[PDB]
Amino acid sequence: RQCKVLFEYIPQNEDELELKVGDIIDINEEVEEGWWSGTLNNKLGLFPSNFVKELE
């Protein structure tokens, strides 16, 4: 499962991914409602799911 970042995200905690519009994240799992782990540029971290759109 993959998603595309729709909006920039500047991390608030060191375990969160920095997101730029157009990044493609490989989705891992839900940590809590609204926050998922995924991988981006060989880094695993958390990201807010309302920032992305799930791809086909």
Partner: peptide, 13 residues
């Protein structure tokens, strides 16, 4: 409008 990140409570287990 840009989105607001949800609150966090948990680290990855």
């Amino acid at each position: 409008q840009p989105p607001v990140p949800p609150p966090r409570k948990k680290r990855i287990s």
